[PDB]
Design an enzyme around this catalytic site. Sequence first.
Site, short mmCIF file in Angstrom:
data_model
loop_
_atom_site.label_atom_id
_atom_site.label_comp_id
_atom_site.label_asym_id
_atom_site.label_seq_id
_atom_site.Cartn_x
_atom_site.Cartn_y
_atom_site.Cartn_z
CG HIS A 351 -96.74 -41.71 1.65
ND1 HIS A 351 -97.27 -41.19 2.80
CD2 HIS A 351 -97.40 -41.11 0.63
CE1 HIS A 351 -98.21 -40.32 2.50
NE2 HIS A 351 -98.30 -40.24 1.18
CE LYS A 542 -93.83 -50.93 12.97
NZ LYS A 542 -93.96 -49.86 13.97
NE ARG A 543 -100.27 -55.49 6.38
CZ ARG A 543 -100.87 -55.41 5.19
NH1 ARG A 543 -101.84 -54.52 4.94
NH2 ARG A 543 -100.52 -56.27 4.24
CE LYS A 548 -94.43 -51.62 8.52
NZ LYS A 548 -94.49 -50.19 8.97
CB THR A 650 -98.62 -42.72 11.90
OG1 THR A 650 -99.14 -43.94 11.36
CG2 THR A 650 -98.26 -41.76 10.84
CE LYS A 654 -101.95 -44.60 14.57
NZ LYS A 654 -102.26 -45.82 13.84
#
Lengths: 810, 810
Positions: A351, A542-543, A548, A650, A654
């Site tokens: 992952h 998101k974290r 990111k 993911t 969504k």
Amino acid sequence: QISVRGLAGVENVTELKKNFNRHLHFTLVKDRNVATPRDYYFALAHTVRDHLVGRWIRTQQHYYEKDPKRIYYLSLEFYMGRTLQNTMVNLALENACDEATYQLGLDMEELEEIEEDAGLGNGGLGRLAACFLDSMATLGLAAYGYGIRYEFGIFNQKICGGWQMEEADDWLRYGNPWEKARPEFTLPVHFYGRVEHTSQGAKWVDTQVVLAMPYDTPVPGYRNNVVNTMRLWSAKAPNDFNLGYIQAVLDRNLAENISRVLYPNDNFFEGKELRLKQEYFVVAATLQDIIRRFKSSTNFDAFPDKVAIQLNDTHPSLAIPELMRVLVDLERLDWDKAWEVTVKTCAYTNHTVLPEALERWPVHLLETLLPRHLQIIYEINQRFLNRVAAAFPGDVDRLRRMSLVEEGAVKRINMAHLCIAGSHAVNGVARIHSEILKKTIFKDFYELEPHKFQNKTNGITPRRWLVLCNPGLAEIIAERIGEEYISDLDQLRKLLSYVDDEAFIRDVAKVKQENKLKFAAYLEREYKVHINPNSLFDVQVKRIHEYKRQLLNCLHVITLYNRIKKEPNKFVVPRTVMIGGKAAPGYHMAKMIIKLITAIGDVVNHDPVVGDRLRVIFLENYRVSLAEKVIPAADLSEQISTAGTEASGTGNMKFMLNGALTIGTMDGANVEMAEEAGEENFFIFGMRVEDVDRLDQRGYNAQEYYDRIPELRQIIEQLSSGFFSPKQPDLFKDIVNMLMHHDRFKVFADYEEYVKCQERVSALYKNPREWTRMVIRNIATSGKFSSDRTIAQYAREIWGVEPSRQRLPA
Amino acid sequence: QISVRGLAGVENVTELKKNFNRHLHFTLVKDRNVATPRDYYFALAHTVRDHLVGRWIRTQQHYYEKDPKRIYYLSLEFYMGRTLQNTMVNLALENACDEATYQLGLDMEELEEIEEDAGLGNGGLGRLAACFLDSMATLGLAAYGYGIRYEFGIFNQKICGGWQMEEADDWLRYGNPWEKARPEFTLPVHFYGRVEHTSQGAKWVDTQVVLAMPYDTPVPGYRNNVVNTMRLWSAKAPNDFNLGYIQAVLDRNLAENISRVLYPNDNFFEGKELRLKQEYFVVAATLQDIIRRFKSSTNFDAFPDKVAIQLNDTHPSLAIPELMRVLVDLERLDWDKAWEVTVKTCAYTNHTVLPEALERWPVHLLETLLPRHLQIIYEINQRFLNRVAAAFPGDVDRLRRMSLVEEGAVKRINMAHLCIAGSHAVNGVARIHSEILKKTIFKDFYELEPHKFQNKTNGITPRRWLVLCNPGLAEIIAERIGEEYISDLDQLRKLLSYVDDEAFIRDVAKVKQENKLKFAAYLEREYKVHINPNSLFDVQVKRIHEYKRQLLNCLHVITLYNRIKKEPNKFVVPRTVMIGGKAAPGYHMAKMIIKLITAIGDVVNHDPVVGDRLRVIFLENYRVSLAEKVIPAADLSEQISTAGTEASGTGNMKFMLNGALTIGTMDGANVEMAEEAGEENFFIFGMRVEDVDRLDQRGYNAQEYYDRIPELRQIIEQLSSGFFSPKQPDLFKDIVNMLMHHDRFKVFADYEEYVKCQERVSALYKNPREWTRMVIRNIATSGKFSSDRTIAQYAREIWGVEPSRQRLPA
Ligand SMILES: Cc1ccc(-c2nnc([C@@H]3O[C@H](CO)[C@@H](O)[C@H](O)[C@H]3O)[nH]2)cc1
Ligand SMILES: Cc1ccc(-c2nnc([C@@H]3O[C@H](CO)[C@@H](O)[C@H](O)[C@H]3O)[nH]2)cc1
Ligand SMILES: *Cc1c(COP(=O)(O)O)cnc(C)c1O
Ligand SMILES: *Cc1c(COP(=O)(O)O)cnc(C)c1O
């Protein structure tokens, strides 16, 4: 009320009402005169739970009789969220319960808000495991999720003075009605000790014993009467543990701490002994359970025909040498035969390619904690490297690169290498990621064993992530194309024939508007914050991580603010910018990013010249239950990681399913989402992976961008000078220093293209009809991203089992 | 089957069967094909529990409406034992459940053996509290038992190589179906900190907070539909506790250790900080609950009219300064008024005069842990001593003796003195003990406030200790005099008119014989030991202590053995000598006594010349459930403490009710038992209290007895020389040294009279008819020793409430 929520038959409603009253009296030991909403929640939960029981017993009986191949999904994380609504959805009981509770004078939506999230995960990896369980049950697979029952899940986040504070998530305080303790199936797990070599094999002796007690949670499939099991192990001390007297009893906590708390790191490896104990604990207990079930069907030739073990990243990698230990040391199989069984049983999903996330355990820890496992790992390594040498004679650097044992200051075991050697299949989680694995990090292994390497693009369950959280959208879709799409999401393609239908266009826009009003209302109630529901809802949840690039979002927000201050009387499309997510408690830069976001809000949200044209909100305590609220409300989904860093994503999926457009890089599954919807229906910007490699080859120099882009220079000068922190002018120095001199994620490199792409977003939002038409093209092409599709591919291409949509008898 | 077990009506049996099947399916989530006896036990327990619920809710509602005076019984120990059978007995459900389970193919007696004892006590004090709860419910008092929910109760005792080993009592492992967690009524408890003096009073600040979470257990009265509550507090850390991150969560155990384990000392004071925290924890949580309930009925004048607090020894003594703290610091009452309320509310029961058992806390511990309480205790002491000075002017030694503060190497607070000063009533637990209190240890206080001092002779509940454990005896009694005696035990006097009835004599003897066969069978099954059921069953079960003189029993056993070896072919009445009990883990001499008993058995039980004329058995893991088995089986009850040391005893009473004769000293309640039955019907021997005092005045010299009694000299020589420990000849040196040079309990002084009295026992046992007639005279006069009588006296003479035998509506 609405069709997809099932029937509210008089007989059913009557029976639910009497069982609700029964539980309130007999189970909760309350009367209606002193019952609180929490008591009412528990009475409803017990009433719904009763409907699982027959199906659960019958499902497990059915597997015992038919003896299908069993799938064991091993994960250290299962991010389940709330269970009540999901259970009602999957059993077709939602409208009936709504009616029953309404007749009792209760608002079911209010009772649903009382339930705690089961927060036994950090983010995407944990939530993937949860979607996967839902899909495996819906597809009729004999599947078991195995993990750890943490007493404390992911921490609750409070923001104090703009800073993250952590509080323990005491999720079990009021009880968990969904789990069933099974103390009768408690199993021993061994630690420490030493290895003794006898005439007939090795023996692991003088060990410390910790007991693993299972708790079983039902996992209902969608309207098929299948109820599978998630078994989570809890650590208990034996009764003679340490057995002056008082201290010996108090010291039982040493053993029981193994299951106390989830490590709160996302995409980061922390090599602590307690974590290693957690990893072995889950593996050792699980494997005894697997073997017991196999023997209760001597001949281990058939083991891989009856058992599949799926490793969710390397966290449960000790399954490989543990299975070898059991087969060689306890069942007395010869090595080669044990290895054949092990390889054919185990499969590994990767992952992440971020180096700091990869598990490399110090040999000295394994030597002390798991001395027999270290011996087995060494033997695996020697036999593997003998194969490499035979295939690539004289290539001594390949031998060093492929070894499970890494030499250096401290010797370490590379757990990813162990997993590849001991698995018949290795997969990544999106096409670009699986290609990256073969080209870079696992290139040598791909060259040795090309057949092992696969792709399985991630997905999300459309039960939780459409029907549950966005009933309004589910309903208007069902009106046109029926209900079958909920378990066959590819049927959403039928919606393309409605892209020019004026009624559908209006209904899609109305549903979004209602979702936005409801969320704006939630904000005011629970957090006293005022937002404009006609603004574009621009959301990045998101974290918090450097890769990111919440920071890139921050730079755009300040750019918008500065442009308004420059031309106050010029029209701009109003935005509400919402950013949420948790930072790992030890991750200093992530904590500073949260502080920057709140600091930007403090300035922007109180500037009278801005008015309500721009608001910046930090969404506190982002978690599964908050995702279910904000995602249906979003207009724009921010998916802006540096190309090559987000393995799949993911949250992206969504948002697509719930009627947001996406602004993103060509990273992870964003690539496949744009391919499905058409690039014209996606806001793609920035460097591709090849562009990142080019920049790394000549050397990333951030100063160049600062020198050439005046809007960017202005922002950095504001940050440096204390514009966003007047009382502490140097507060953001670490952030500026990172951006200018050691930014591994190239924030400045994508800034210009990002800002330009955001302008195209704003231009489209000014034309409601065309915005909505593009939304319909996204929703209609989201089918590939169902976790039902993902799990069908694992089943056929890795596990060797056929899914089934056939119902068991009620 | 038998009358006292209630009706087995077809409707009831049918309903029990369907609810049993419902719980097995829905509650336990099992089907009959894989259910074990443990699952069947839980299904029955849940079925019976359902019958408590309506009565529990209605009882507590009734107290809310009628607002009677409430009785709060505070104890650190509640030794409850098993709950299933007791609940069935009190609800009149035993025969119905027996029939229901029989029809399902189950043996209910077998299912009852699966339940764990709730072992939250050490012995007599803990078990008294449990009998008291049963009597308070049976007499309709609005009473609440408050304590600590220990995770680990009294340890399980294993005997290994003749030595005691301890194992943790993990009584909650499989769940406790009888308790209901009430997390919604969690309350804060404060520790450490410091005192700040403001304009308006003291303030206790900078404290550490621990939460007290209540668990409620129902306490059913005998066939009156009253169900009272026992509320036990469990320690929880607050969620911001210690809030790097992982360690902070793990360190929650520091707070939660308060309720982890019961201190396993009986009649001994261990002055450790953890114990003090336990004592404050129960008091502080309980008092907030009391006050809340009082305010939910401002004017604290009426507090003592609505509240009684009974202190079970000094363990909850901090209730006195805590109540003062709340009234003065938080409610702002003036001191004198607060003190009046406190005195009128609180009452103190003393259970021991042994100096090593009295709680005297170091001032330095209280100063650090409870700084405001220490201030209040000092103020109480100064005001009290001002009263003493006014009453006894110039008597400066009286001032030193009566002070709450003891001077010396370390300054200590005498908690018994605190309790006397702050209570309107002080009682002992048997007439001789209450007299001892007034003559010796509390003489000065009695002279100051004679009206405070009372007696309340202890008792036992005839539900558990006759109907439950000895249904055969209960039945043959009921046949003659009806069932009313079960809640009015004085009616057993009617049995005196049957002492010459040949049928009754036969039935009494038959019931004992059946009890002995059943116990002999239990021994063989569960412990592989062979005993002769025609032998006299000579039983001493109680905690192991020097003052209880298990050693004196040992000397008699060796005397019998030596007499047999001397004249092997002479007839002696065969005996099985059974000794059981737990030793505190740190009490070395008690551990050596256990080893001596097993060592004697190793010799005696394997001597072929003895045959089956004498057997010595150590009964392992003595606890409430074992008492229920052995007491009905006993012929002779050993109650042989040194006169003046056993405050009351309650095992003594259990044996009397169940048809054993008693050999004992004139100590504790033995005095009153002999008075009730007649001295001719009791085997009394040894020094009286006055004789002990005489010996202490001239000086106890053990050597004198050794020199004058040849049978005694022989035994000591055997012990010293290694007769009972061949491989370790000096094993018992500590025992011999204690007996010869520092025996505080004068074992040798009572040896001759004890041996002679034992000969009279054996002579009577040879005449079965006269033995049985004496038994009938004991059973018939046991009525005074019902805890119903005891509690009626507390109610009328201390608490100011009237008992009621009137039923609430079902
Ligand atoms: C301790 C630890 C916890 C989580 C992770 C971790 N590694 N990748 C992920 C995430 O896994 C998701 C599901 O495939 C992906 O969608 C996402 O791209 C990854 O960053 N998490 C790694 C280590
Ligand atoms: C820690 C501790 C535990 C128990 C005791 C304690 N003090 N007296 C007793 C016993 O209390 C019984 C009930 O009144 C009495 O019948 C018995 O005589 C006492 O020895 N136990 C004292 C301290
Ligand atoms: C879906 C989800 C994630 C994953 O989000 P990404 O944007 O893919 O990182 C993380 N946390 C929660 C609570 C989620 O529901
Ligand atoms: C009654 C009882 C006691 C008290 O026995 P004494 O002989 O009065 O010390 C101790 N332990 C248990 C288990 C009991 O049932």
